[PDB]
Amino acid sequence: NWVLLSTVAAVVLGITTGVLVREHSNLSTLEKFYFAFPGEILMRMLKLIILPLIISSMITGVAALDSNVSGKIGLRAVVYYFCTTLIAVILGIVLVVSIKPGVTSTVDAMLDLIRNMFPENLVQACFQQYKTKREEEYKIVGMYSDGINVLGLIVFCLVFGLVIGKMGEKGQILVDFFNALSDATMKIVQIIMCYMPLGILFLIAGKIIEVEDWEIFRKLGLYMATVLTGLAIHSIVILPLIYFIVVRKNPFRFAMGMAQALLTALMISSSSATLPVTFRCAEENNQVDKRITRFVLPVGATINMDGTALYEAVAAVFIAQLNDLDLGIGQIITISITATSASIGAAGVPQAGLVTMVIVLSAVGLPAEDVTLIIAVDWLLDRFRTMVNVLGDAFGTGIVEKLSKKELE
Amino acid sequence: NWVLLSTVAAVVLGITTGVLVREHSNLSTLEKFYFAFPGEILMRMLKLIILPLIISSMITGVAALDSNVSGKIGLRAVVYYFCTTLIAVILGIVLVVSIKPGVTSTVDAMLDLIRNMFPENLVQACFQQYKTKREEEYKIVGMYSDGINVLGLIVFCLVFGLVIGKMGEKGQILVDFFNALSDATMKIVQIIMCYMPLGILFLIAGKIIEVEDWEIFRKLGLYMATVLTGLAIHSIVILPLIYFIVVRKNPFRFAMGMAQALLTALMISSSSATLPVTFRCAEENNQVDKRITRFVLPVGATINMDGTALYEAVAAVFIAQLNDLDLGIGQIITISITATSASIGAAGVPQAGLVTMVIVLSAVGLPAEDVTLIIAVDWLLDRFRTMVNVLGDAFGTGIVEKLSKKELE
Amino acid sequence: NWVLLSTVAAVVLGITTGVLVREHSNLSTLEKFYFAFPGEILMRMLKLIILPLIISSMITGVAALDSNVSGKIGLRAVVYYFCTTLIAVILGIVLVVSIKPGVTSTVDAMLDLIRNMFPENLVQACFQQYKTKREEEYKIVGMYSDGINVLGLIVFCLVFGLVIGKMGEKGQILVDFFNALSDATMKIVQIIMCYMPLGILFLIAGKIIEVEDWEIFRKLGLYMATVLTGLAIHSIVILPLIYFIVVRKNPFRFAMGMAQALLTALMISSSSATLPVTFRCAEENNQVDKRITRFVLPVGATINMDGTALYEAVAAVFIAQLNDLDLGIGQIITISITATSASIGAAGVPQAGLVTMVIVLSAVGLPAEDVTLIIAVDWLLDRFRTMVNVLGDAFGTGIVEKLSKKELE
Ligand SMILES: C[N+](C)(C)CCO
Ligand SMILES: C[N+](C)(C)CCO
Ligand SMILES: C[N+](C)(C)CCO
User: Fold this and answer.
1) Counting ligands in written order, which one lies closest to the CA of residue C61?
2) Which ligand 1 atom sits closest to the C-alpha of A304?
3) Which ligand approaches the C-alpha of residue B85 most closely?
4) CATH, domain C2-396, list 3.40.630.30, 3.30.930.10, 3.20.20.105, 1.10.3860.10
């Protein structure tokens, strides 16, 4: 594949250029800023595109989710993809606080989630964010600090996406305007990813120059041991339990029937690319009828956020812990809800692991140029994330036969 | 009706909760801020929607006003609905300064009306507002303070609405895009009004807690005696004179012929809901032909701002007087022109008295959470405002028979 | 013509009012600000419209440039209209620094061209601009100062215009939405130009009042001797050489064959108005086939920026030199690239010399009210600019017969 091979060949040459400058020359504090300029322009190019990508892919992802939730079968998969998303948020927050990869009020930060879901302006929500601060027996002021409001542009586009879906023929030009705006801002991300090999070369090399000790290669080992532990309690302990609670039919036999599509997800790392394969393995091996697989698998490519909350919401807390933030427990729930929501906006993006992380790091107020620690090993962890998304969707096929049995007639 | 009954039942339970907390417990200065948080989220939800509601309803209200002003009949109703709008602005400013409900340069503030009609940026006009200040033999600086520019987003959408109406078939996708955007942002205001009973419960109760003296129940009695005096010189003295100046046929006989539609407006408080009724009473009782009633009544549901300048531009000055502002005479004309213009944007909104007031209080730089004094008694005054809008439109039927008599052949 | 006669009659009455106030009365520092208020509102009206004019005319100018570059003929005119545009930028920068009309780091300002082509936000690019500053062995901070980012709204709309052109039928509603938005924001500029005679009357008169010495009538004579010298090395020395390098057929005979359309351009000063004439003189007199004139003349009305870089990028440096700026050499290339790019956005505007200058003066951070020095003599220099655009396009017809000879079969 091109986009995988070229990114690995730019991480290898990024470390090759990176140690042949710090151990072979000596740059100033200014010339280590001009050396990381082609990787600076990539971070401006990526933040440029997340505003028409959030707005267009949330409006069309939700206005096409209607008529894919027809009946009660499409409602008994929205409850399932919210019940295992909420457990994956709790499992991602617990595992990043217990392990703490990258080390050494709370009510006023949970009421800013609900304040930022409903902004006071839709144009200010594209570049500003409401943060409140207790001061003086106390009183409370609000500031509107900078940084994009991703939570309020997603709650509004989820409401605006439901309204124009149900409007019928009067709101067909609004679905057609944003379907074409979503196709046009996924062909610009394909143009940016033709520059992304050159940009991550000078982004990796600008980090190995400034790094003086190999402690950051240990915090990058405890990060892969928090993602591969979040994505191994979910595939072994959490999701085979949820199947066995309602469907008493041995969940380790269900996964062996899907072993052709689990092994295919380790080679592509894209859920919508092996979506023709997981259709072919579910019906023939597990003996499930086609009227419920065609109703939960198209909603399971928009709503299945089990893998994001264990990978991109552990990465975005690891970056925040890397900058010596204490974060409390109220700004961790702020991050893991912004990281889980931003993956619905970065829905079918080509390099959807890199783009989603630039959305959350720009939203929660972190340096987006710290994503180059994550894309060094993103090609290992995105393969295993979509093995959970394929296994999570396959258990979402065999669960809605059991709550929907009298509905099929 | 649901939206009336539920709002009265949330004002009654708002005062019931409000006196069973201040006279039964004791909250801190912080716990009186967390008690009014469900009413804070309503004020964020309302300010969220006034930006796509101003833009879409002004573009479609004006691009559909073309072909409803065909001939000279539709021009002799635009002059009439500007001549009685300007008298209602003068009558609303005089009555709120002479009575002063809620008590105890000028050239640089009239040149900021004309500066804010033509902003220097269309994206900055969505959240910022130009205020100029004389300083030092003097010189003049400009600041761009915050708060939405409603005047400049209405003057531009009035020009942009006329241009795409007259473009014909080349500008039909622009009328279709904003017709669907206006239908989609009136179905979101219907979703907000399903939360508005809960929000105004904690908004009323958060005001009765902090109020320690019943002087504010006297300033709320002088406010209803300024609206019901502005809307009783207009229906008795001003508008029956304007009929009798040009049409010498006893205006108190004209209103008795419309008594079925005046009494219907006291039960619905919506001009476009009794618009089928005022068609049926004008032609049969007053003997007016249908070629001029169908030409002045659709422009009389977009342009008839006689009732707004006596109700929502007396309320927005009463709120400004409540915060101990002196206002001069130049910032009163700023308010009553912003309040009269913002009711064309809040054109056919369900709760169009509450939404219009949040537009003007956010525009002229006032606390939008002070609208809860007004919605306590809005269900009394909005019935009597639309009785003036029905009587003002009925006299706008019997006036254009007299200036248009040779035009009908 | 109306728009020429009325503008000359407002420059004459502007100087007539201007010397009958300063030599016949005495105004304060405040009353010389209220006297130039009708010309202030014109500068707010002009800056109001450059945001939907840049966005709509760049998207439709580029999405219609596709299928006008079919084959290799339409590629051998994009190289020619970039090779003579880059020489006109170098000739405009050299001539405004050598003559310096209006008198008496660099790497951090060339890396801000590339930083401002790719902004971090599309809504902030409509009103804000990234300027970086070296400070402290040094480090580099970035600020986001105010003023519209014209470079980043043109690079994005050039990429977004190419993507929706090549999308075919899926991106036809996006071409139809911006074709109608571009027709609707050229009919608002025609409404503004009905006020522009009144606005430039009080704009000229507000400058002759404050001027106390006639040195500014000498710097306005060295400005016309830099534009008419830039547009006389291009028409005599630069462009007849580029023809004679590749096409050995005596370029002074080519221009005599186009003498009917050169003389017509001195009477209209519009390239797309004499575009039917330069078609009729190229084929009959110079004996060129119609298959290459119809392929380079529609791309030569969007891409031919030879005349802008010698007129509007010498004017925008002359205004910057007038305010006693030193500008280095890095902020001169910033101006002449912003002035050359902004003339693709002001593509077919009626008063396209006045509107283009308000775009660049607002972009590079200059007073837009200093354009009234330029529109005093714009009707002399815009005639001679389009004589170079007609001569530059005619030599762009006789050049693509020589590189395309085996392609025509
Ligand atoms: C299923 N994905 C996580 C890949 C996209 C939904 O946000
Ligand atoms: C006639 N109304 C006042 C109800 C709407 C026009 O703004
Ligand atoms: C050819 N013009 C310069 C007139 C427009 C292209 O920007």
Assistant:
1) 3
2) 1
3) 2
4) 1.10.3860.10
